Amino acid sequence: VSPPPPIADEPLTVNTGIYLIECYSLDDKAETFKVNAFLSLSWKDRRLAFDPVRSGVRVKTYEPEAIWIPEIRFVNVENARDADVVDISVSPDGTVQYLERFSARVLSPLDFRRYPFDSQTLHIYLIVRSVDTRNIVLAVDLEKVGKNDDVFLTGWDIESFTAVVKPANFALEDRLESKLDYQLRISRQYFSYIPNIILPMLFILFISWTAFWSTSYEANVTLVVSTLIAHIAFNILVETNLPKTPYMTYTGAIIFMIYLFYFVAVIEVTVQHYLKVESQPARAASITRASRIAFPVVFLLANIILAFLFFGF
Amino acid sequence: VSPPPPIADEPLTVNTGIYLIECYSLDDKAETFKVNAFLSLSWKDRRLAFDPVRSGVRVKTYEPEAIWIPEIRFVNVENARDADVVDISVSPDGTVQYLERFSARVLSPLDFRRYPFDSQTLHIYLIVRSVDTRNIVLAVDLEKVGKNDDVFLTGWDIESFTAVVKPANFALEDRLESKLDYQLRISRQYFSYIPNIILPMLFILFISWTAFWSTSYEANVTLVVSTLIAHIAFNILVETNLPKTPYMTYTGAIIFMIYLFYFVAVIEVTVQHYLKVESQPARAASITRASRIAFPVVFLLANIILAFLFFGF
Amino acid sequence: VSPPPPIADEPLTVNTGIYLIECYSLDDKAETFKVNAFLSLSWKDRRLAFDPVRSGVRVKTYEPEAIWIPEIRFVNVENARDADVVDISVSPDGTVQYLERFSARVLSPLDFRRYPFDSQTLHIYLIVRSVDTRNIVLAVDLEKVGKNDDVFLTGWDIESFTAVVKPANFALEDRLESKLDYQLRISRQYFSYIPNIILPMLFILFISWTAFWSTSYEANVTLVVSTLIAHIAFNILVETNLPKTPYMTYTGAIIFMIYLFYFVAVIEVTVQHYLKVESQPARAASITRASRIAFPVVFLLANIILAFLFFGF
Amino acid sequence: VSPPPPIADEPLTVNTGIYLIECYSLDDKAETFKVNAFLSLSWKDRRLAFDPVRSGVRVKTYEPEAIWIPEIRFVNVENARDADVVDISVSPDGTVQYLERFSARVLSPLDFRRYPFDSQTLHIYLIVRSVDTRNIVLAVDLEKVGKNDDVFLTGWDIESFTAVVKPANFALEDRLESKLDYQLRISRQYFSYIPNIILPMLFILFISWTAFWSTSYEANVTLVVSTLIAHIAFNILVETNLPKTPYMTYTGAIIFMIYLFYFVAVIEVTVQHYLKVESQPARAASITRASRIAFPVVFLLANIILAFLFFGF
Amino acid sequence: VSPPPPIADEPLTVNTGIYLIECYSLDDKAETFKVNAFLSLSWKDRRLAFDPVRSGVRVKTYEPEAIWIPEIRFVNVENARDADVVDISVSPDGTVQYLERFSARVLSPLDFRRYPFDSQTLHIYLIVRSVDTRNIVLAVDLEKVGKNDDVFLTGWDIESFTAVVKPANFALEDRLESKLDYQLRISRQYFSYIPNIILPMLFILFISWTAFWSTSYEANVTLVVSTLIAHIAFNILVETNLPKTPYMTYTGAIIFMIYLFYFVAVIEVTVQHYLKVESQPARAASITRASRIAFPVVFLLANIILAFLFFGF
């Protein structure tokens, strides 16, 4: 139970990789998801006398966990990973293929700035426990990293898992911490939201806009205010799906725009009624005719501007 | 505590089966349910010297857990199953009937594509721990698999449990993993939903449709918009029972159809009022008479089309 | 730590009883409640040499838990009961009075078919661990079963605890399992629900019924539809108290009846307006006068029929 | 590890007291709160040879937990208290001052019968573990009981903690159980509820009452029914703060009174409209003038009666 | 495992400091947040013979946890901190640099008196375990206290962590307890709340205020009451973001002011209608013209007064 002696006086290259098995239950509210995968490391200790016999009659040698194993810890996870050791084998004067089955509650933030069509990346970092004087450096093994076993999570389509970048950070000016980064690139399927969150609100707004084709003040007032109440009720209904973040959101500005449009519609209706009362029917009709075309065009232009602001640039 | 020597050089056939005892609390939101059942395996080790005495005076021999027992693990469950060993007996040069009482929080997905009348299947897979060189293959024992002990869960009617299929999958190109599949086929009782989720919404829509039999613009506007608000409030009320999935749902399209019908009704009322104002009473009456028959017929045809789309084909 | 030898070759009669101490927190949604009580068994082993000295100078002998104690397990509970041994004493060639203080989360179903005035029964079953060949049969000791220590739970009034029935069931055609049943008969106090769930809804319906004493179509429409919206809002407000079950409920049919009455009222108002427009004032007045008396009488008759259906028969 | 011999043949007086340190998070819904305090017992064993040396050179003697310590258990708490032993010292032929730091989730019921201005008392009972034949009786030590260390909990003002009563109860006719009662007397601060739960509802009711100063039937109907809907919505809004109990509540009857007032207002408006239609303007005006004064006076009288009923008597 | 002998007869100065690493998930409702940081103490024991060899060939000496380590406990946290020892080294006749990686659920109250623009301070206290007679006094080490490693939490901007004050409190008149205070000064970003909680309510109120520019009593009543209902619905919608405290809140008085304004608007509309009915059109017009200017000016003045009350003074 000791690190191999530094005869070469060089850090041991503990190559590692993760083969995803089954991931599910991505909770947006808690920013948590489950991960089940393989952990395959290939740390080599030839000078530790870990059976470097060089005997062909005893190839594929098997050893228990009595020898020291480089401990790997996940910074993201808040609980200890349930480890299940599978294979502990070393070749004659070769490397050790030590595999494990693990499940953990890995933590990762989310970016709800493009909520209907967002493209978050899922992060997993791991660290090594540097003990004694033998430096331990983590490398990337491209052979045993991937997810090609038909894994799926509802609402998303996986596209990449082999980012395998190594952003060696710093902490209290420490010597070295590799902190291998495993990026799980995912995208959201948006077809279930168009007829659920967007179209019902647009229909309510369009129902509101019909007040310009009438001349009854009571009917216009009832239409507009009851439509506003219906919009508030729908916003209450779809509160769970909508995200609540302390920053601006693309889906969080359309609602404010809708409120502004309701206020402007109320002001326009009141102005029309006042002008009609003050005996200016020609001016009232001109204002109504102008508004009929001004409202939807302004709405479309503002939506285009907001899309170009949040997306694109 | 060693696997039996492979004198025959063949994998040991560990026959197994599950006798359901009590299952309850199927939570649709978390896709979890409780299972209490028997686990009866019949693994045979004649060459392991596990009392193959062939003595009639000592039949029905009893042994403790000192001998090795093939460990069986459930991939679905997220926690260790509470095991209660009952019988450990071997016949002279026979097999071992090792029974257990277990309770676990087995996980399984659900398909909310036909929510009022869905027919989900409940999955349970188990795996064996291949140790040393003696291959372990899992088989199906039809004698001790079933649920015929008057087990019930509220809202469902069980119909089948003996699917006992063996879909041997692959993981990292491993040698063999039987992964026996235990399918619990269930169906939902829908009579408690017709007078709770469907009829109250249809009644609200029918109340909305009565606006075509009136000529008061203010009354029509109040009727339609307040009916829309009532529909939104009812949707809020029945949110818990309705499922929220990232895919299309049969019960998730009727609501969108209802919103579309409300929008079309508002447009029709506005058109009628505008035509009446513009001194076209004959055209207004013709439009109203046409709409009176066009609305329910179109609704019925669209419902039939949606039913033929989601169900049937 | 061995069962007493079957010198008489008869099963040992382990008499037992439960003296309730403090029960509280009956959660209807989770169908769970806390129970704190005494467990007093009187299993006798005279031939086990468990101090059958027959010495008057050493009466009321005290022994530790070194001797075997018949393990008692509760099938209902999902967790191990926190056991606190109090007295372990045997009389000379007598029985052992082994008492314990236990608290457990015992599970039991509920019948929400008469929710305002329901009379559920609370079930507790226990089983014995049959070991070796000495058969163990559970009996009922009427001396130490009861709750006469001023125990109360909010909202209910206890009436019986000494049902002490023994419904010996079967499981995989086993030899014997006594499975003593302890029925806790309780009833619900309904005076806090009449002015909270029933009267506010009846008042809303009565407010709706006043539309028949008016001739303004706009006023009638506003009254009826806004009353329907208020009823929906109240149903949302009292959702937590109301039960959600996959079967028919007495309180679950009155709501459907109320929706039907709202729909019929809307139809009647529309018919009256149409007849008045079509120049049939006498027929409109006759219809209104008939409806004024027909509505409450039909409502009362339907309520009586529903009461006779759910209750009584 | 044995109780002191009863040379005097008298029960040992284990004086005890609790010095509150920090209490917080009183959850009304779960009836739970956190308590951190000191536990100082002064049980004396002179005849147990627990260092009764009577040597002045070794005063303030220190001993470890090797000697037996009378176990103290809290019936209210559902979990074991995290104990932190601080001082274990005995004077020469004196007593033992054994102090501890403990934190527990102590349970206690609440009385929501005067919710805005309630004065609940917070209960803590403790019991002793009577072992062997040496009787253990719990007493009260007024020296080390109190809370004078500037402890506060939000929304309440503590007024008393030294009730230190000893209601020795009975359980299965046991010999003796002191069951010391520690009453924490608290009161609620009500100034944050007057402008949050009471005044907004009174304002809504007053808005409703303005219908008597108008003659438009449609306006009166809209006013009253929309005000009722607003009241229901506010009740939904303040549901969390309001308590839900299976008994009558002072704040639970004002709401029913408000519903009754809404119903009576609707009836009065309908009666006025019917009388005006039936050509009785003088009677309609007289009824309106009478109601204008009858409504607020009756409301005030009923509120006074309800206050005198729930409070006072 | 003994404290160093007090040869100097002076308390040992155990200097300590916390270097923040990663803090996140500040839950306002539960007043909890996660903290991951370094714990670096520099307690010195030269007279304890903890390798005071004064040998230059063995500088940077390494020792295991066999020697006693001063236990540090956090009063705020409700759970034991997960400790990970990193470095245990002593210089020849020097001090011990004992570092640890810890994560804990530290508790701290919040002041929701300026909720949109609040400036809470986050508190962390630690205590030492005084054992034997060697007094232990906690000091502050400014070298290893800070957060300069690019740590961020959503919605807040950290500004200070090195308060490192030492408010030595008292408990039962104890000798000494340093109770070092670590203040984490944070501020809230308010730009995400202006277009989400404030502007939508101001727009609703402004929509309400348009009733003064009309003469239709029915239209005015519908406008005002439906606007009030919409305001209640919005308050329900934004309930989660708003804080619920038993004391007055800046955001908790604006709502009451809005309710008062709605009530006054209803009263004004009723007064105008009554005066118009009683044939006083000049007085009605004068009242309307006065109110048009009186309402917004009074609202602005009251808002300024409330701001000067809660903020500033």
Residue numbers in the entry:
A (entry chain C), B (entry chain D), C (entry chain E), D (entry chain A), E (entry chain B): 5 to 317
Question: What do the authors of the reporting publication say about this deposited model?
Answer:
GLIC, a prokaryotic ligand-gated ion channel found in Gloeobacter violaceus, served as a model system to comprehend the gating mechanism of eukaryotic ligand-gated channels. The overall architecture of GLIC is similar to the existing structures with each monomer featuring two domains: the ECD, mainly composed of β strands and the TMD, composed of four α helices (M1-M4). In this study, we present cryo-EM structures of GLIC reconstituted in lipid nanodiscs at pH 7.5, 5.5, 4.0, and 2.5. We identified a resting-like state, two putative intermediate states, a putative pre-open state, and an open state.
Two cryo-EM structures of GLIC reconstituted in either soybean polar lipid extract (or asolectin referred to as “aso” onwards) or DOPE:POPS:POPC (2:1:1) at pH 7.5 were obtained with a nominal resolution of 3.4 and 2.9 Å, respectively. Local resolution estimation of these two maps (referred here onwards as GLICaso-pH7.5 and GLICpH7.5) in the apo state shows higher resolution in TMD than ECD. A comparison between GLICaso-pH7.5 and GLICpH7.5 structures shows overlapping secondary structures with minimum conformational differences and a backbone (Cα) RMSD of 0.52 Å. A similar conformation of GLICpH7.5 and GLICaso-pH7.5 confirms the minimal impact of distinct lipid compositions on the GLIC structure in the apo state. Multiple constrictions at the pore of GLICaso-pH7.5 and GLICpH7.5 are observed, with the most significant constrictions at I16´, I9´, and T2´. The highest constriction is observed at I9´ with a radius of ~2.24 Å. However, the radius at I9´ falls below the radius of a hydrated Na+ ion (2.76 Å), reflecting a non-conducting state. Truncated phospholipids (PC in GLICaso-pH7.5 and PE in other structures) were placed in partially resolved non-protein lipid-like densities. In GLICaso-pH7.5, the head group of Lipid 1 is involved in polar interaction with the backbone amide group of M252 located at the M2–M3 loop and this interaction is not observed in GLICpH7.5 and GLICpH5.5. Therefore, our GLICpH7.5 and GLICaso-pH7.5 represent a state closer to the resting conformation.
